[PDB]
Amino acid sequence: KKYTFACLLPKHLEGEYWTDVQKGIREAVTTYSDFNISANITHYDPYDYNSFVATSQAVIEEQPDGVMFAPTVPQYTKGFTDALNELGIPYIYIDSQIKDAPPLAFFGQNSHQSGYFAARMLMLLAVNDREIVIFRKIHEGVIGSNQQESREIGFRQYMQEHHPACNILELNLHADLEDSRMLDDFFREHPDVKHGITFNSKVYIIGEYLQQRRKSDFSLIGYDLLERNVTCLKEGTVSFLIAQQPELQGFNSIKTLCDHLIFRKEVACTNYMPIDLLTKENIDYYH
Amino acid sequence: KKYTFACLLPKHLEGEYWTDVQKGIREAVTTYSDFNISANITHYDPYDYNSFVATSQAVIEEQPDGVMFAPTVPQYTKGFTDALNELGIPYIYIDSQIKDAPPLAFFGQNSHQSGYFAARMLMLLAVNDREIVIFRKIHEGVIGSNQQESREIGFRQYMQEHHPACNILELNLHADLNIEDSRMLDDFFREHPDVKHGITFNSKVYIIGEYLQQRRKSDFSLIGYDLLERNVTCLKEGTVSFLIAQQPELQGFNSIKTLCDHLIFRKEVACTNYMPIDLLTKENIDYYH
Numbered sequence A: 001k002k003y004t005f006a007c008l009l010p011k012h013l014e015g016e017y018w019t020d021v022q023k024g025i026r027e028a029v030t031t032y033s034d035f036n037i038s039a040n041i042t043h044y045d046p047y048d049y050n051s052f053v054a055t056s057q058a059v060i061e062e063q064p065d066g067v068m069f070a071p072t073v074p075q076y077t078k079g080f081t082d083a084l085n086e087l088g089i090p091y092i093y094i095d096s097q098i099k100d101a102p103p104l105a106f107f108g109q110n111s112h113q114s115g116y117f118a119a120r121m122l123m124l125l126a127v128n129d130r131e132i133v134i135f136r137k138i139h140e141g142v143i144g145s146n147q148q149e150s151r152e153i154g155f156r157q158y159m160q161e162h163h164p165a166c167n168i169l170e171l172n173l174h175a176d177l178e179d180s181r182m183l184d185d186f187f188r189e190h191p192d193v194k195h196g197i198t199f200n201s202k203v204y205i206i207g208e209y210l211q212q213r214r215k216s217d218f219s220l221i222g223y224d225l226l227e228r229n230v231t232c233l234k235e236g237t238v239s240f241l242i243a244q245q246p247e248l249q250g251f252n253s254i255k256t257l258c259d260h261l262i263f264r265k266e267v268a269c270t271n272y273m274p275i276d277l278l279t280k281e282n283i284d285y286y287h
Numbered sequence B: 001k002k003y004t005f006a007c008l009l010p011k012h013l014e015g016e017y018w019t020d021v022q023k024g025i026r027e028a029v030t031t032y033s034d035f036n037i038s039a040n041i042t043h044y045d046p047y048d049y050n051s052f053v054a055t056s057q058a059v060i061e062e063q064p065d066g067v068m069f070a071p072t073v074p075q076y077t078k079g080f081t082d083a084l085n086e087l088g089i090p091y092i093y094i095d096s097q098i099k100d101a102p103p104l105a106f107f108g109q110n111s112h113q114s115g116y117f118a119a120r121m122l123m124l125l126a127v128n129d130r131e132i133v134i135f136r137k138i139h140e141g142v143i144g145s146n147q148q149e150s151r152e153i154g155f156r157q158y159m160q161e162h163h164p165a166c167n168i169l170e171l172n173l174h175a176d177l178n179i180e181d182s183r184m185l186d187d188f189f190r191e192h193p194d195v196k197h198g199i200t201f202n203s204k205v206y207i208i209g210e211y212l213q214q215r216r217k218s219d220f221s222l223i224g225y226d227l228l229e230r231n232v233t234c235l236k237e238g239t240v241s242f243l244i245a246q247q248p249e250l251q252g253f254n255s256i257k258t259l260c261d262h263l264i265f266r267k268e269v270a271c272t273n274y275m276p277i278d279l280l281t282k283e284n285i286d287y288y289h
Ligand code: NA
Pocket: A136, A137, A138, A142, A143, A144, A145, A148, A200
């Protein structure tokens, strides 16, 4: 019988952030083909905690040899991890982690440090601005991402720490809205804000909006190398993109499971991923 | 018998730039121990022609299967590369390219783009600055490094395209001294009290950074290259604002790997391997690997 590694990740469309993590998973599968391993990828609605509970219970009943997954908020993840620990099934957290429920290994960015870093870079662009804006993506009241929330916290800590006088504005766009009207009104109400940032992976939304309205007097800092994000980076609507090597996170998760289960090797638990800064001038050599 | 790859690098002290490239080479040797290969590292005097010739000749006379070589003063190398081609000994360039003498493969940054990028980052720092300064350190007059010279050209191009009004000052420190580095700096900052931002293209930015630290001067920030320990310390202390890395470990590792699969695995290999232009700050340096 083949090895089965259950991979539980957020629902998404092809080409979005999670596409790269999955390609890393598949690359790992082929690499370890001599061991006949198999990745069974299922998804959950990151905005609906019950979706995580139902799908994670399915994973549990599939009795995989190992599991890698993006945790949702703590209290809705606890039952899953407790069950896996009780069944002796090792799990790996990716993207974010739950510190009081340690896994075999964690692969993701130090969210707080990532946010702190982002603030430092943003202040470099808006050195003497009186306000900056944080764009978010919410649905059913939640932000749907521990990392997106924890990054903002680190960000805010840096701001309160180095630029307490700079006013921080927030605009919560709707996940499955029209982002355009939201933006039109935002700029009408706040016509002098020159710089903004988002902690989700869809800064292109704001970028394309500016590109279309011929607005070149506003630049964004965003996350991840989604095709559309990079286009906005090259066009100038986005000043910097922060990457976390999603492919490597996916690959290393499977490799770690293999190392632990197959090779029976010891493995490092905490694996903070880098906080890579990309600009139009260095993106082409970034791999 | 065995496979022998001669690696010719500039003499240096442990902890300088090349120490990482050497670790890379070592990691590669062990990884391919199966094919029983050995990397023979020899250091050379980069500014003593007669010396360089003697060591290079010694390398050629060792009859190596392959060679990886980091060029400093290209005008002292034609004899070496002609001899390698004549003997059918494939060679790899790292860090700097020597256009009139193409190698089997090259590993290093696209110097032009690296400098262009460096300019962008410096100007984010010196937005409204009338002048900026490039810091260099020459031996026998030469700026000994095509990568360095070329980086400077890309830097000036960006400055011409974006801040043609900004004055570009230059301060040359000398290795074949008796004019001490700190004395050069005192005169410069004395005659140029207003300059607030600077940059260097060699990997010894710590010389300027530690100077500012010991003089508790905090009204000036540098942009430098490479993750030498002294560079990182200056990065963490604030004298240096940004450091640009190029993954020296991987360049050394890849050099040997390329030689192995070319000579041993009879594989095809790309000639140009442009390394990344990584930007590091105090806030992300600890998570870079
Ligand atoms: Na969200």
